[PDB]
Amino acid sequence: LVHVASVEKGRSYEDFQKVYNAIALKLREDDEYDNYIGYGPVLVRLAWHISGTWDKHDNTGGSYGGTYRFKKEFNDPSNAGLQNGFKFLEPIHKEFPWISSGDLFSLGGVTAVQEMQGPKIPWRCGRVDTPEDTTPDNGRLPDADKDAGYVRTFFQRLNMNDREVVALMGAHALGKTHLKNSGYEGGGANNVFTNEFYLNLLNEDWKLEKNDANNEQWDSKSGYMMLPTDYSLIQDPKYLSIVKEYANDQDKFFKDFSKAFEKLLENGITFPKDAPSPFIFKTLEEQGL
Numbered sequence: 001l002v003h004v005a006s007v008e009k010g011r012s013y014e015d016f017q018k019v020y021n022a023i024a025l026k027l028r029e030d031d032e033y034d035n036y037i038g039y040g041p042v043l044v045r046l047a048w049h050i051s052g053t054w055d056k057h058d059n060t061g062g063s064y065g066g067t068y069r070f071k072k073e074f075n076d077p078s079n080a081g082l083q084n085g086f087k088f089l090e091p092i093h094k095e096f097p098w099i100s101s102g103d104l105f106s107l108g109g110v111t112a113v114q115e116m117q118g119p120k121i122p123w124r125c126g127r128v129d130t131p132e133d134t135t136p137d138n139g140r141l142p143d144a145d146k147d148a149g150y151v152r153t154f155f156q157r158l159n160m161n162d163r164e165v166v167a168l169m170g171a172h173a174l175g176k177t178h179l180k181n182s183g184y185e186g187g188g189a190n191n192v193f194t195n196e197f198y199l200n201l202l203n204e205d206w207k208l209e210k211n212d213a214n215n216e217q218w219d220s221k222s223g224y225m226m227l228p229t230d231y232s233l234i235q236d237p238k239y240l241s242i243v244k245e246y247a248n249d250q251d252k253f254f255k256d257f258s259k260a261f262e263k264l265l266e267n268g269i270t271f272p273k274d275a276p277s278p279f280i281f282k283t284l285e286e287q288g289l
Ligand code: HEM
Pocket: 041, 042, 044, 045, 048, 081, 142, 143, 144, 145, 151, 168, 169, 171, 172, 174, 175, 176, 177, 178, 179, 181, 182, 183, 184, 227, 229, 261
């Protein structure tokens, strides 16, 4: 099973920058969502969930086929709440109907990270919409109630190593949990991309509590929360080291996140030798828009 990247016919960097800009402008303008967090965090989560279905063993799942558009994947309980991100992107897709679904969903994530003052994430085009029968079954995204061994084993399926895992988890500095979506409540309503996840892990006083959905989570007096899988990064000696590294080096964290997130979004895709090199998009700020 091979998924070969195929550039949307006749499209070049300038076409994709226009799509980036349309998403970025909407992010700026629809700022009310989720008590003024806006749509950045949910779009990052969407890009991760459409990618996180990949299995390195058979090359099924991943971002290529844009299969979240199909009912089976759209209604996965693990994807509860991501419909808000789908609805955000819908008008954009109507404006630029030439772009594939996988390309749009993944570009949404890249745009969100950059517009939230994160690192630049190189991005490649050419994902191709695949038919409904290529939709992966539910159950491939991870559980939050587990420990460090689970997290490590889970991520081996996505060909991610310890450093890549800890860097990717830094995105949890963004946004919040919603009891109705996942059975967890709380967060920090943050919409700026920083290394604060790692700082909060090391510096807050965490207490284990049972929430109103009968799930255990770690809570701090500052009003923050960690999932059990978040907290596992300071329980495991190998993860802890890396957590300390990112807490003390913002630039390192940005560079490692950029690499891991691009890899996550590209897993399962074969890029021909003639393919364009990755694009790096300018932010609205860089364009004076
Ligand atoms: C062990 C792996 C992971 C687990 C178990 C996990 C679990 C969760 C849960 C339960 C939520 C709350 C969802 C809600 O109630 O709305 C959440 C939120 C979020 N996750 Fe993860 N996650 C993991 C990895 C990641 C990764 C790798 C990224 C991206 C690089 C990511 C990005 C996000 C973002 C941005 C939110 C906030 C969404 C919002 O504010 O609507 N997560 N995660």
